[PDB]
Design a binder for these strands. Structure first.
Lengths: 107, 143, 94, 132, 50, 55, 353, 228
RNA sequence: UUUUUUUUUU
RNA sequence: UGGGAGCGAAGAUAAUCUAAUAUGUAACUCCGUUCAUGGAAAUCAAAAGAGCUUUCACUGAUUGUAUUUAUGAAACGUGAAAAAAAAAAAA
RNA sequence: CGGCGAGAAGGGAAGUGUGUUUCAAAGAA
RNA sequence: UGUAACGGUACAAGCUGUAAACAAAGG
RNA sequence: AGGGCAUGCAAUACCAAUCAGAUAACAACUGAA
RNA sequence: AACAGGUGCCAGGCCAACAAGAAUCCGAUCCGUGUAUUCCGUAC
């Protein structure tokens, strides 16, 4: 249910970021000079700033919720529990860990 | 016209036209030649395929059937009270033992002249016969 | 014929059989690898041997004898200073 | 050798030391390939990595676990510094990005926060501190 | 046209049956059924008099 | 005019649009059963590239 | 069979992207206006279209619409050659293909040594021969946001046509009304727009192609159709041109239908030639000469030299051919001898001159 | 080598779909029997419907793993169980042909791809994963992914995925024959009706003469008399 | 001259 | 898989022996087979003319290489099957 | 009662006598 | 994918996977 | 396919110079497949 | 080839959910699809 709203929100944010980056580059290109155009661009960037911040405020809740099962849960593991409806996960490869010398100890 | 009507309707092929066929039919009718075998055969073939406009994939009639084939149920269409004719009272006599004298007779100049006929007359005769021999059974209400 | 830059001038416009049955010991001198279509070697892939690689050759005496032997290329060790990399590259096989 | 080369088949590469070219490689999509072992399952490796550890800046968007408790002092100091010295979201890696350059090239002072706001990392911050 | 003929032609679109391909010829043997085939399993012998 | 057309010939004369004499023009013709029409008095001549070199 | 090299290249057709469902952003992602690709928020960052500027510099170009099946290095040399006309080219960069490093994506960057030199290359587009798929290149200035004229050719064509039609109409008018004033006759001429055919006053095509009314008449094919006469027969701005035109009379030339047609036809070919020549300038104009070594080097970048016959000799099959045949060697010796005799004839002309 | 020819010849038989059609003629015999049949093994594992087991439905989102399309996402259009194949839009286009209709001169069509060469993407993760069915207390069936453990979306409507098959149309047109002549193509119902009328008189006329202006009459058909 | 292709009406 | 690429000896024939055939055959490594291989002329022919590539038949066991033993689907040419120059400046 | 838009790279190959023929090393299913 | 080990079944060239021969009834 | 389904076959390759192993700081250091 | 299976052994008319004879004579024990004669169904 939540995925669908997340999608759209994301898309919108994506678009707004590209427009804001284009406006910032245009403003930077004409630093040593003053004109009406520069003011216009500043105004539009100002607008888009809020227009974008609102999106992130709205988005925050969804991202957390969505990314629920992505991470492991000991509670749901066959090791720490025996209740019906188990959950399994695949081991990752962390160079930071793999490059280190560690003994097969458990305590 | 009979030879050409059977050819394809492609670019690289000579084929007559419908109005040309009617003009030729009238021209032949005028000279007491309307009853032409080749003309009738070409006319039938021309309308057999809408003058070559209609096209269908190559179709071959089946000469054999597989074992345990499909079954289709259908009632008899022949009007009631009709049955095939029965043979004679038991059997015919032997061919070599009994039928040795009746199978042979003296020849005549008429027989010689009939034997000395050409193939086209025979073919025409056959065609006419088959044409004439086309009949169907009638119904009570049809009469 | 076509592709004159490449070896096999007298082999293109011939019978299939000739091509299939062509022997390798009929050629005395070596042939360039680029022209011959030979695959690159592992030692070449690890260095800069622009037109150089392992080749083969055959011998012949007055007694109509023939053999085949392997020959290695000529490689040198040097040092190159790359301005873009901003680091020296010692021991470059060239 | 039997057949001569041409204008299209005169350049070759080593069997092992070569450049992948799926676009210019023989393949049979309409055929079963046992070599690839379609039955065998494979894990999901992280997309973003920093100092050998998962990138903390990509967590808010992409999610995933963080091995914060496995970090050493050395790693943790730099990690901390990273998150303190005006972090940017574009510093993370990309999966098959467009051929054109990325925004990371410039990395100038922007007037907005890309992807997420700075307020979305206190959870991680706490852990970092604890680890410290 | 004949009424009977019309009736008959009415059923032209009915489903057909199976048939063989053009020029279908059944393969038949010439040689006898008796021949040593000692490269066969136990239960697959055909020798009677040879 | 007296040519005994075979299968091969017939195929060409029936398939390839270049043999269509009903729409023949000396200034615009195909090359070999092609779909696109070429300019005979133009296409037969060379031309120079952006660099000014012959092509 | 073995691993292919850079010689072997394959490319398939691309199916156009159509969004069947507008409310399904999952299965039908929205396209991007910058990268021309599907919006991947999950793994791709937003672009701005000015990243190359911070890399190279302000004085840069954005060339797009490149062919396929060509090496990046070859494209770089071609581009350098092309661009060298204007000024000194700094560096040329090409983005390889995503799935094919040996292939070009379709975009490239060009850097110039100067601002004005760069500015001059933005005016007109780049046209490629058949060899290159006839791919028209699109340029853009990152420092100015200036684009090229992609429709130049197509607009010129219509101008040509309009010229033809104006000539015809003038002729007709002359025929129907005898000689007419120069300043008065011109008012009965019209042209049509390139985008959509709309009746307009003549003169845009004249100014485009010919450049002047006077020139129109002074042209090669045009002069055989009409005749101007000075007032006594019976470096100029618009006002002066008009004033001169005010006191002249046009006289037609008696011609047949076939001749007229022929002339009309000829005019078009001439005009077309003009257009072609404009776009097909050389790459070695106002430049010093080059050594033969350099020339050879240049050649090498496109074409390879033939293999020595010494080596080729060995290729002979022993089954049907003799390896070392005295007659075969003698034939080649005679050919080599004849080559010098052929060369002497060409060399004698320089001494004679 | 002097065995390539024969080798190839022999090999061809394998691919050959013997027996082949053969029309009869006058004093001519078939040769199909003389053609050896291909060699095949019987004892082998039984086939399986991978489509059914993988929980893969038409209209689902898939991504290409190998081939030219190293990374490319699409929508499943068609599934063939017997061949164990799928058709994915905008992928694997190699079959080209002449335009049978309005448009350019050449048109291409997508080709089927092995089911094994594709996988189902994760909803949220957007990575290849597995999907399992689960039944509720009420009998409601729900498709749940492995990675994210989330519910799968519904398939796309068939009305949106319906497209015309021009390859089939081209094959149908080719099956008939070359294009018709302009001259022949022109209709002529006025004379066609006269020819059709004469056809019935010729066929069902029983040799009777045609009508005339002076004698506008024709003999009636004769029935089939029974054998008394 | 000693021949020959059946549908009319999805 | 007698398909393609690298390397690649001997028993045997020549009534021992060299070349030569076996054979570029066997073993080893790699590509994994019509969605393949190949390819749209600086070719062939000689005063005529054919017109990318690929399969079959005949020419023909002719020409050629060898000789003490063999090997050789040669080139031009004819018949037949299948027929394919390029979708294309952008939106 | 048919009359000079009369041209299309200057390079490859073929007899070694070439006023002759052909071609363009450089494009996609 | 194809196979080997242990356990159960009637210790077996079968079946089966500690839930080791079945859920068939969601108001 | 409602539900369940220990263990072994040495597995970051749904990707990426080569050379041991949970796949090796440069160099030493080499290559017909 | 009515080899399509079974029924005690060789079955178009018997079991097999849709057509068609418990058919007559002969038979060592001994059923008996078997010999002789004859009827019927069939777009099987």
């Amino acid at each position: 249910a939540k995925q669908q709203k997340r999608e759209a929100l994301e898309t919108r944010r994506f678009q707004l970021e590209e427009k804001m980056l284009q406006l910032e580059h245009r403003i930077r290109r004409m630093e040593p000079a003053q004109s009406l155009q520069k003011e216009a661009w500043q105004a539009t960037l100002d607008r888009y700033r809020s227009d974008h911040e609102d999106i992130l405020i709205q988005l925050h809740p969804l991202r957390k919720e969505t990314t629920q099962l992505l991470a492991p849960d000991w509670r749901y593991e066959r090791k720490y529990s025996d209740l019906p409806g188990p959950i399994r996960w695949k081991k990752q490869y962390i160079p930071a860990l793999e490059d280190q010398y560690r003994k097969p100890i458990r305590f | 016209c009979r030879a050409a009507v059977n050819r394809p309707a492609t670019r690289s092929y000579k084929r007559p036209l419908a109005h040309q066929l009617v003009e030729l039919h009238d021209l032949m009718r005028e000279r007491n030649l309307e009853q032409n075998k080749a003309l009738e055969q070409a006319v039938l073939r021309f309308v057999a395929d809408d003058g070559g406009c209609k096209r269908r994939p190559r179709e071959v009639k089946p000469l054999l059937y597989q074992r345990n084939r499909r079954y289709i149920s259908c009632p008899d269409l022949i009007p009631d009270g009709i049955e095939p004719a029965r043979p004679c009272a038991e059997a015919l006599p032997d061919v070599f033992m009994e039928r040795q004298a009746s199978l042979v007779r003296a020849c005549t100049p008429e027989d010689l002249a009939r034997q000395e006929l050409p193939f086209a007359v025979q073919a025409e005769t056959a065609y006419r016969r088959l044409q004439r021999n086309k009949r169907f059974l009638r119904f009570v209400q049809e009469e | 014929p076509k592709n004159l830059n490449l070896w096999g001038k007298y082999l293109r416009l011939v019978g299939r059989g000739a091509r299939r049955g062509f022997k390798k010991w009929q050629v005395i001198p070596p042939i360039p690898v680029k022209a011959y279509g030979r695959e690159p070697s592992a030692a070449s892939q690890t260095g800069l041997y622009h037109d150089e690689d392992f080749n083969y050759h055959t011998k012949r005496t007055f007694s109509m004898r023939r053999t085949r032997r392997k020959i290695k290329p000529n490689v040198f060790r040097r040092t190159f200073t790359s301005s873009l990399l901003n680091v020296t590259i010692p021991n470059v096989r060239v | 050798w039997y057949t001569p080369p041409s204008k299209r088949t005169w350049s070759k590469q080593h069997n092992k030391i070569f450049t992948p070219r799926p676009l210019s490689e023989r393949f049979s999509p309409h055929k079963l390939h046992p070599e690839f072992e379609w039955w065998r399952e494979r894990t999901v490796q992280p997309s973003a990595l920093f100092m050998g550890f998962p990138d903390l800046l990509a967590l808010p968007l992409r999610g995933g676990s963080a091995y914060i408790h496995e970090m050493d002092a050395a790693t943790l100091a730099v990690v901390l510094a990273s998150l303190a010295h005006s972090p940017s979201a574009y510093s993370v890696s990309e999966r098959r990005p467009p051929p054109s350059p990325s925004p990371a090239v410039s990395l100038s002072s922007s007037s907005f926060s890309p992807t997420h706001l700075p307020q979305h990392l206190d959870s991680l911050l706490a852990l970092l501190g604890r680890q410290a | 046209l004949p009424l009977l003929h019309r009736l008959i032609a009415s059923f032209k679109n009915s489903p057909k049956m199976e048939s063989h391909i053009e020029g279908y010829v059944k393969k038949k043997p010439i040689a006898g059924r008796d021949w040593n085939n000692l490269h066969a399993p136990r239960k697959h012998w055909k020798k009677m008099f040879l | 005019p007296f040519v005994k057309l075979n299968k091969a010939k017939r195929y060409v004369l029936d398939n390839w649009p270049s043999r269509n004499w009903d729409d023949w023009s000396p200034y615009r013709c195909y090359v070999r059963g092609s779909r696109r029409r070429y300019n005979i008095p133009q296409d037969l001549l060379p031309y120079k590239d952006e660099l000014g070199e012959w092509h | 069979a073995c691993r292919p090299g850079a010689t072997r290249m394959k490319w398939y057709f691309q199916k156009p992207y159509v969004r069947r469902v507008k409310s399904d952003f999952f299965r039908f992602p929205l396209l991007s206006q910058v990268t021309k690709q599907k919006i991947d928020w999950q793994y791709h960052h937003p672009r701005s279209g000015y990243e190359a500027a911070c890399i190279f510099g302000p004085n840069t170009l954005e060339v797009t619409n490149l062919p396929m099946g060509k090496t990046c290095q070859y494209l770089q040399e071609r581009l350098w050659r092309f661009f060298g006309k204007f000024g000194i080219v700094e560096q040329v960069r090409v983005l390889p293909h995503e799935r094919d490093p040996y292939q070009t994506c379709g975009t490239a960057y060009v850097c110039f040594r100067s601002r004005m030199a760069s500015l001059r290359a933005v005016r007109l587009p780049v046209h490629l021969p058949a060899s290159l798929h006839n791919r028209v290149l699109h340029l853009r200035h990152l420092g100015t946001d200036r684009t090229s004229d992609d429709l130049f050719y197509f607009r010129r064509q219509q101008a040509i046509s309009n010229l033809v039609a104006i000539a015809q109409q003038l002729y007709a008018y002359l025929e129907e009304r005898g000689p007419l004033p120069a300043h008065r006759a011109l008012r009965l001429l019209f042209e049509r727009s390139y985008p959509r055919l709309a009746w307009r006053q003549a003169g845009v095509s004249v100014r485009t192609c010919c450049g002047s009314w006077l020139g129109f008449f002074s042209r090669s094919p045009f002069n055989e159709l009409f005749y101007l006469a000075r007032e006594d027969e019976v470096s100029l701005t618009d006002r002066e041109e008009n004033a001169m035109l005010e006191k002249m009379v046009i006289f037609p030339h008696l011609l047949s239908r076939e001749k007229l047609q022929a002339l009309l036809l000829r005019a078009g070919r001439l005009l077309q030639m003009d257009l072609q020549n404009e776009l097909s300038v050389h790459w070695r104009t106002d430049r010093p000469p080059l050594p033969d070594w350099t020339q050879k080097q240049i050649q090498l970048w496109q074409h390879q030299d033939p293999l020595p016959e010494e080596l080729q000799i060995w290729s002979r099959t022993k089954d049907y051919y003799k390896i070392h045949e005295e007659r075969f060697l003698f034939k080649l010796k005679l050919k080599k001898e004849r080559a010098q005799a052929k060369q002497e004839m060409k060399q004698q002309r320089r001494r004679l001159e | 080598s002097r065995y390539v020819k024969v080798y190839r010849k022999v090999m061809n038989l394998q691919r050959r779909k013997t027996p082949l059609p053969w029309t009869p003629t006058f004093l001519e015999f078939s040769k199909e029997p003389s053609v050896p049949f291909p060699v095949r093994e019987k004892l082998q594992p039984a086939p399986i419907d991978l489509s059914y087991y993988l929980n893969m439905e038409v209209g689902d989102l898939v991504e290409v793993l190998h081939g030219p399309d190293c990374g490319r996402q699409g929508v499943v259009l068609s599934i063939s169980k017997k061949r164990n194949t799928v058709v994915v839009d905008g992928c694997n286009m190699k079959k080209s042909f002449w335009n049978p209709g309005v448009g350019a001169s050449l048109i291409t069509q997508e080709m089927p791809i092995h089911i094994t060469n594709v996988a189902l993407l994760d909803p949220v993760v957007k990575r290849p994963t597995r999907v399992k069915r689960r039944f509720m207390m009420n009998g409601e069936c729900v498709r749940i992914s492995k990675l994210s453990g989330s519910a799968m979306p519904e398939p796309v409507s068939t009305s949106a995925l319906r497209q015309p098959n021009l390859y089939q149309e081209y094959l149908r047109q080719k099956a008939l024959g070359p294009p018709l002549k302009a001259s022949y193509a022109r209709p002529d119902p006025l004379h066609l009706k006269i020819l059709q009328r004469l056809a019935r008189h010729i066929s069902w006329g029983q040799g009777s003469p045609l009508p005339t202006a002076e004698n506008p009459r024709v003999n009636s058909p004769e029935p089939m008399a029974l054998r008394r």
